[PDB]
Design a protein around this ligand. Structure first.
Ligand SMILES: Nc1ncnc2c1ncn2[C@@H]1O[C@H](COP(=O)(O)OP(=O)(O)O)[C@@H](O)[C@H]1O
Ligand SMILES: Nc1ncnc2c1ncn2[C@@H]1O[C@H](COP(=O)(O)OP(=O)(O)O)[C@@H](O)[C@H]1O
Ligand SMILES: [Zn+2]
Lengths: 605, 48, 48, 689, 85, 97
């Protein structure tokens, strides 16, 4: 600022300008931001009558371009990042030329040895750039921080201002300036504070501990503190798998100054943060779509046989049961989750129960779903050692003296839960599920907390017949061994049989041998665009079908093998709506109701 | 054995055995630090 | 024990253990074989 | 070094916005006379204590300028910023132009209004003597009077301030009319850098402190001077200014001591609360985080726990950071200083009648059939079954509380169970009545419900005392508590509930708790038989798992159970598919009433205290004996349930009172109990289908 | 000037007398143990070891006797049973 | 692995079977024990080493210790008309060690 820039800085700038001149992808992107802000500014300014100023750099573009500048960011970021942002802050002034703040950087890619788990983040290579992967373990209450303070000198109507700097605003150890908050003017007058002409920024620290499946298990966790400036504050939450990049500063002067041992305070200045996805995580896969990927979906969406092949392509590892995995595919699609005006929300999620002879795929099918649903969590049921899959214990020692944490089902707020060995799971959870299933709300009433939290999520149940095996010559209710309301709460109950034979059993050997000796990645991208864009309204061509069938089964099935209730009316709507989503249909059609009937014919008879 | 440790031979080399209970944190200590006077604008270095 | 068995009862056939406590949501590879020993005691048929 | 505290300037110019205020306070007649001056006459009358300033008037005042070509110099865009300046300067004008007192000072008045009067009088006598002494010392108003003012030292006008000043924003209507200022923000949405602004936030007020005094100015007495010393207190803490700062002791050898006066010290009523995020506004996967609200003055009791409110107020820093090491410099805590409150479910206790609410009642009445209109207007999103929903309206209006005038009390309230099988919706009716009931609450079978139905005891965060924290039956009172999965509760829950249906109170005698506690709640319960659905081969005392002693405290139970049928299920399937085809309810020659206007109607009916005619009195008796004789002598076999009791006779009376209140009628007819008995019997005729 | 300074890792270990051979009457005693540079992370809690070290003396901010010091060992090298468990 | 108050010091307390690894553990009222303090002796008899996998420490501790166990018949009277495994509450495999 006040000192005269030396060539060791002036070069770094103009050298970085030849990079951005070469890779226009960044020059047009910063422009694309001030396109967006001015459209909103015009929207605010010119109808009533932002994006947080950072760019991600692919480090692959530096390696081939400027080898010593590659090593500079990694080995000496404090001498190479402040000038690169100083270039961009004048590139931004070059792209715009409308009338009239900082601009900042972020990175992506491979850092070699410098990407390491906090198990091996050590007091070697402190100042170097680092990447760390792990669980975000807690987050601090996002405090506002002072930078500029503003005052009024009422004797004159002048305004005065003061500006603050500290250990976390520059990578280099700027000379400290412990300035004093001005309660009196230089002349001696009184002052008052113009709160909100002053400016503020969010401070947060989050503490990351090593990812538990890579961890050499048995050892203790080890964790380090990451400080986030204004931007990334909103994009971390405890328990998610997170990668951070930053500078592992070693600040203060403990021991050697003041008096006495424990060494320097070590932390990362977070300049990039990404959530990432791993098994049983609180975030979706969220694959990006090209304008090409959408083209393939639209080629498919009007072919009159996709649902049969798509239903099959799920699980080549398993033979048969197309009639079931049809429905599990429909669970990924779900309903429309209609929320009514001045009256309570109405369920969209379809919840499925699998039961059958213990030889079957019940435990294995769920590891397709858990591996290929957008968001899923798996629970054993018995072994939910907290309150359950939903609620949690609540206590604190930190400054606020209370905190909350969420169970699996509150974390899985929209997606999937895999529940298996379902009838092991005790009444304490089952009666809590009766709260959830058709209300999708959770209530607790501890000493301090008396409040309602959402759980708009979908369930697979897997169960075993209590007698060890079942066959249809034994009356078909008592084998279910659950309260009749749960047999209502779950929407489709499928009974899988293997009283052995030979004819079908013949083919199985060569299919398994072929299995030891359409595809998955498109389904995710097929489902999410369908989920995001498509919201089928009903159509009269199908509203009659759901009345004909539902009204007949209550005459027939109440004289036969299964119960029928007004609960199973709406399950017809959801399943019809789901198949229309498979069609990407802007509206429901009669064919979807005929499919809804078919799935229940197989499930009931 | 620790039972035979004594104020005798303080700061000699000692050979002893046991079980490690715990391993704490990899605290950070200096070995080179460079230092400036905030008023003299004057630089030195210290090594340990 | 019932809380023990249900995990191994899965890990013997899908070689992972999935945990659902609020604190952390792990799914960790077991990667184990089992050699087991058991007794025929109470082979005598009754239900109670 | 004027490069320190460097000078800057900005488009504001407070030195003539004060010149705008001094017109607005007197130049407004768009709604006695210039109403702010007449309101200030009621301050000069000493009959009100708080001033509410609305942006609704400031905007239309600027239109009367701007459309006359006169510069606005906008206050509104300034005032939504930086309101801690205006709220301590806008009030200065009012000191400088207000009417003189008219009802002369008298003993039957609040004691603070003579203490201020005496200092205000003493202020003028000091000018009156000093001017005459100056004039008498051997030799023009504007010349002289400024000498008096500077040489004197006086009580400041903030210490003579009779009143507390507050603001309320302008609603969206006034923002779109004449074409921002108050989006009701989420506690998550606040994004920090709004510090300074006037903001609106809505959410659950989970927890409040009790009101207590917190000092704003300390007054100190010095004998050897006779001058008072006033210390402004601004932070959470102060140190006693024991060393006498007086103008008479400063230029003196002895610096004699002083003592605080604990009534001359200007206080304010201080209260604070948490608002937790409103749950439907929480993102996916995230948690309802909390914000801290501070209150000063006359507003203080407007916030009560377990209710939903808009808070409007000014959002500000507080100096706190953690604990020294867990720090990165110049951090701040933050709080909201509350200015005005409105609450989406209103307090029944405020219900007076004015030019807009009577016509909202009258237009509801004149269509007639009001009782059936409101029953169908309760939960019209679920099919039929009107007898249940028709009784839920009586649960709200509740009947009459009776005090014997002789040390006895009997419950003026309705307790009901909704027994049945799956598929005939229950929680939707429970949830619908939780919305339509102010202070309504929703509960569940298992987990916390021991403490959750009980007083906890808590070390109160803000101040060094223990407090009882109310579970559902205490977080609700004078209102509905909703219970679900009912029989999946346990004996420790029931033996709390069973006492609350019988009488208005709870009693505790474990650990630090020994109190007797007021419940005053209506319990509305949903429960399922032993096998989810009924079994026709089981008599109801065996089909139902509940003990008949507790059941006798339900004044009605509904055997609300389904049987399949060829026709009736068709109309249901129409209503569900219609209301799922779109939000709208059926095209009947009807309208389902808006809930808030029904809440106003109920709040008026609650005021009615009906009396029973002797004609019905002798009819209720004879019907009871025939019921009780039949119930005992005939009905103790097969489908027979329970026994008739005195309690069911009182149920019929309370229901008969409720009907008469829904008529808005001061007396109870023979026409009422012949309806009440029908609901009692009809609730089980379902069993014969 | 942190950005032109070099730092090293050190670690605190505790060793206790093997519970297989200790007085019946009381708990085992233990020693604070420290190590520097490449000697860090070589050892896992619950392994059996021999330490060669400097038995040394430091002052502890106790709260111990009228005037006293606390013993500690600076490890200057380490070895083990070839791998525990 | 459990607390010690002074300095909040952490150390193992071994079982008596570790404290007596060369010699003998003397157990009084052998029947009157729970789950955990039964599986411990059974693991020691079975294979003479005791696992630890708690508080972040993983170890197997030598428990090469002999036992003299004292027990009482269920109901005090020996009931000589029934075998010992029916007279005592203990089952044969812990009894056969
Ligand atoms: N329908 C099927 N087709 C092929 N393999 C199957 C089928 N059902 C079960 N399996 C076999 O069972 C194993 C998975 O265990 P599984 O039988 O699903 O356990 P569980 O009975 O607990 O569900 C796999 O190795 C798979 O080969
Ligand atoms: N008669 C009806 N009219 C409209 N909707 C109904 C009706 N019966 C059931 N429903 C639907 O079924 C659900 C009711 O579930 P419910 O039966 O209350 O659970 P529970 O078994 O705990 O009572 C609601 O979402 C509602 O939309
Ligand atoms: Zn004095």
């Amino acid at each position: 600022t006040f000192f005269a820039p030396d060539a060791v800085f002036g070069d770094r700038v103009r050298r970085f300008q030849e990079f951005l001149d070469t890779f226009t992808s960044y020059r047009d992107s910063v422009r694309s931001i001030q396109v967006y802000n001015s459209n909103n500014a015009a929207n605010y300014n010119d109808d009533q009558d932002i994006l947080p100023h950072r760019i991600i750099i692919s480090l692959d573009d530096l390696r081939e371009f400027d080898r010593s500048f590659w090593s500079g960011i990694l080995v000496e970021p404090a001498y190479f990042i402040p000038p690169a942002e100083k270039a961009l802050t004048d590139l931004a002034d070059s792209m715009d030329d409308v009338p009239h703040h900082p601009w900042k950087l972020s990175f992506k890619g491979s850092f070699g040895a410098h990407a390491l788990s906090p198990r091996t983040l050590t007091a070697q290579h402190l100042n170097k750039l680092v990447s760390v992967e792990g669980i975000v373990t807690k987050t601090s209450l996002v405090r506002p921080k002072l930078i500029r303070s503003v005052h009024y000198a009422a004797k004159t109507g002048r305004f005065h201002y003061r500006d603050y700097t500290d250990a976390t605003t520059t990578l280099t150890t700027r000379i400290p300036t412990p300035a004093i908050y001005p309660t009196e003017d230089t002349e001696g007058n009184k002052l008052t504070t113009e709160y909100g002409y002053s400016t503020f920024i969010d401070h947060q620290r989050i503490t990351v501990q090593e990812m538990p499946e890579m961890a050499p298990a048995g050892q203790l966790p080890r964790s380090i503190d990451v400080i986030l400036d204004d931007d990334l504050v909103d994009k971390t939450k405890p328990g998610d798998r997170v990668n951070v990049v930053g500078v592992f500063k070693s600040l203060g002067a403990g021991g050697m100054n003041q008096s006495n041992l424990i060494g320097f305070k070590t932390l990362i200045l977070g300049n990039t943060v990404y959530p990432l996805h791993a098994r049983s995580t609180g975030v979706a896969a969220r694959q990006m779509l090209t304008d090409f990927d959408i083209r393939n979906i639209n080629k498919l969406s009007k072919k009159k046989d996709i649902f049969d092949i798509l239903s099959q392509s799920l699980a080549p590892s398993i033979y048969g049961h197309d009639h079931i995995k049809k429905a599990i595919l429909l669970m990924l699609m779900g309903g429309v989750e209609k929320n009514l005006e001045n009256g309570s929300h109405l369920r969209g999620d379809i919840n499925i129960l699998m039961v059958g002879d213990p030889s079957t795929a019940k435990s294995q099918l769920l590891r397709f779903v858990l591996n290929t649903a957008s968001l899923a969590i798996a629970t054993t049921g018995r072994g939910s050692s907290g309150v359950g899959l939903t609620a949690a214990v609540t206590t604190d020692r930190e400054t606020g003296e209370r905190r909350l944490e969420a169970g699996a089902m509150v974390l899985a707020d929209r997606g999937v839960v895999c529940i298996d060995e379902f009838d092991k799971m005790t009444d304490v959870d089952r009666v809590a599920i009766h709260e959830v299933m058709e209300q999708q709300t959770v209530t607790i009433a501890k000493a301090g907390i008396h409040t309602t939290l959402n759980a708009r999520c979908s369930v697979i149940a897997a169960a075993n017949p209590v007698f060890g095996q079942y066959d249809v010559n034994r009356d078909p209710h008592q084998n279910i061994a659950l309260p009749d309301s749960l047999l209502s709460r779950f929407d489709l109950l499928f009974v899988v049989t293997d009283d052995i034979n030979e004819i079908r059993d013949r083919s199985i050997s060569e299919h398994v041998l072929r299995t030891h000796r359409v595809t998955i990645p498109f389904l995710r991208k097929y489902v999410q665009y369908a989920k995001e864009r498509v919201i089928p309204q009903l159509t009269q061509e199908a509203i009659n079908v759901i009345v004909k069938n539902y009204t007949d089964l209550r005459n027939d099935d109440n004289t036969k093998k299964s119960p029928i209730t007004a609960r199973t009316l709406e399950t017809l709507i959801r399943l019809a709506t789901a198949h229309a989503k498979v069609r990407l249909s802007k509206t429901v059609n009669k064919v979807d109701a005929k499919v809804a009937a078919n799935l229940l014919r197989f499930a009931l008879l | 054995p620790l039972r035979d440790l004594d104020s005798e031979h303080v700061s000699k080399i000692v050979r002893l055995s046991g079980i490690i209970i715990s391993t704490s944190v990899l605290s950070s200590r200096a070995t080179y630090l460079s230092i400036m006077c905030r008023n003299c604008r004057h630089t030195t270095s210290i090594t340990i | 024990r019932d809380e023990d068995r249900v995990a191994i009862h899965e890990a013997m056939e899908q070689q992972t253990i999935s945990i659902a406590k609020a604190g952390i949501t792990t799914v960790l590879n077991s990667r184990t074989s089992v050699l087991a020993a058991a007794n025929p005691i109470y082979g005598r048929y009754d239900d109670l | 070094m004027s490069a320190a505290l460097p000078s800057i300037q900005l488009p504001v110019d407070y030195n003539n916005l004060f010149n705008e205020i001094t017109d607005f306070l007197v130049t407004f007649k768009q709604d006695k006379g210039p109403k702010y001056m007449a309101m200030l006459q009621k301050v000069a009358n000493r009959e009100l204590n708080s001033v509410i300033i609305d942006l609704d008037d400031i905007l239309q005042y600027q239109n009367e300028k701007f459309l006359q070509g006169t510069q606005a110099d906008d206050l509104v865009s300034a005032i939504q910023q930086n309101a801690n300046h205006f709220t301590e300067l806008f009030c200065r004008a009012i000191d400088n132009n207000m009417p003189l007192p008219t009802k002369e000072i008298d003993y039957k008045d609040d004691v603070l209004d003579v203490i201020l009067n005496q200092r205000r009088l003493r202020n003028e006598r000091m000018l009156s003597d000093r001017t005459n002494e100056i004039r008498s010392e051997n030799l023009m108003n504007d010349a002289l009077r400024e000498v008096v003012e500077d040489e004197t030292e006086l009580f400041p006008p903030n210490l003579t301030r009779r009143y507390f000043l507050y603001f309320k924003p302008l609603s969206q209507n006034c923002a779109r009319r004449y074409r921002i200022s108050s989006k009701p923000l989420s506690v998550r949405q606040i994004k920090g850098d709004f510090l300074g602004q006037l903001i609106t936030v809505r959410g659950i007020i989970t927890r409040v402190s009790d009101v207590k005094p917190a000092v704003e100015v300390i007054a100190y007495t010095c004998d050897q001077c006779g001058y008072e010393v006033f210390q402004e207190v601004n932070s959470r803490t102060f140190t006693p200014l024991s060393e006498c700062t007086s103008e008479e002791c400063s230029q003196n050898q002895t610096k004699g001591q002083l003592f605080m006066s604990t009534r001359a010290s200007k206080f304010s009523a201080f209260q604070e609360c948490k608002i937790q995020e409103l749950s439907q506004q929480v993102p996916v996967g995230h948690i309802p985080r909390s914000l801290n609200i501070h209150v000063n003055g006359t507003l203080v009791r407007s916030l009560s726990p377990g209710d939903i409110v808009d808070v409007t107020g000014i959002f500000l820093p507080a100096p706190y950071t953690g604990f020294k090491a867990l720090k990165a410099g110049l951090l701040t805590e933050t709080y909201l200083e509350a200015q005005f409150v409105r609450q989406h479910k209103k307090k029944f206790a405020s219900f007076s009648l004015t030019s807009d609410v009577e016509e909202r009642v009258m237009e509801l009445i004149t269509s007639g059939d009001v009782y059936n209109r409101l029953a169908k207007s309760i939960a019209p999103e679920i099919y039929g079954n009107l007898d249940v929903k028709k009784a839920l309206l009586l649960l709200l209006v509740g009947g009459v509380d009776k005090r014997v005038g002789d040390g006895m009390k009997i419950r003026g309230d309705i307790n009901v169970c909704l027994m049945g099988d799956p598929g005939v919706a229950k929680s939707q009716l429970l949830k619908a009545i939780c919305k339509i009931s102010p202070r309504g609450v929703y509960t569940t079978g298992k987990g916390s419900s021991g403490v959750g139905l009980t007083a906890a005891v808590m070390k109160d965060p803000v101040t060094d005392e223990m407090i009882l924290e109310g579970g559902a039956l205490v977080l609700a009172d004078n209102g509905i508590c909703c219970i679900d999965e009912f029989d999946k509760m346990d004996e420790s829950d029931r033996t709390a509930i069973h006492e609350v249906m019988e009488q208005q109170t709870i009693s505790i005698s474990k650990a630090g708790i020994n109190t007797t506690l007021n419940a005053r709640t209506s319990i509305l319960a949903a429960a399922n038989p032993l096998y989810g659905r009924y079994n026709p081969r089981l008599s109801p005392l065996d089909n139902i798992n509940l003990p008949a002693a507790l059941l006798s405290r339900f004044d009605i139970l509904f055997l609300m159970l389904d049987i399949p049928s060829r026709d009736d299920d068709e109309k249901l399937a129409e209503h569900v598919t219609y209301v799922h085809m779109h939000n709208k309810q059926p095209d009947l020659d009807f309208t389902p009433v808006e809930p808030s206007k029904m809440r106003e109607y109920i709040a008026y009916a609650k005021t009615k205290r009906p009396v029973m005619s002797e004609a019905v009195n002798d009819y209720v008796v004879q019907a009871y004996i025939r019921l009780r004789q039949d119930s005992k002598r005939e009905m103790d076999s097969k489908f027979s349930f329970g026994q008739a009791t005195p309690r069911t006779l009182l149920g019929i009376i309370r229901l008969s009172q409720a009907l008469a209140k829904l008529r808005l009628a001061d007396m109870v007819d023979i026409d009422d109990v012949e309806e009440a008995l029908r609901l009692v019997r009809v609730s089980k005729e379902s069993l014969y289908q | 000037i942190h950005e032109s300074s070099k730092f090293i890792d050190q670690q605190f270990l505790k060793l206790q007398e093997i519970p297989e051979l200790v007085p019946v009457g009381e708990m085992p005693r233990n020693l604070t143990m420290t190590c520097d540079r490449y000697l860090t992370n070589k050892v896992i809690p619950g392994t059996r070891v021999t330490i060669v070290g400097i038995y040394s003396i430091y002052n502890s901010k106790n709260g111990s006797g009228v005037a006293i010091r606390t013993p500690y060992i600076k490890i200057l090298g380490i070895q083990s049973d070839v791998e525990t468990s | 692995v459990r607390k010690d108050p002074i300095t909040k010091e952490w150390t193992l307390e071994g079982g008596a079977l570790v404290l007596a690894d060369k010699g003998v553990c003397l157990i009084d009222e052998f029947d009157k024990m729970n789950d955990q303090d039964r599986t411990s002796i059974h693991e020691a008899m079975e294979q003479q080493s005791i696992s630890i996998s708690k508080a972040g420490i993983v170890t197997t501790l030598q428990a090469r210790c002999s036992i003299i166990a004292a027990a009482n018949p269920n109901g005090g009277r020996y009931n000589s008309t029934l075998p010992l495994a029916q007279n005592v509450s203990l089952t044969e495999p812990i009894l056969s060690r």
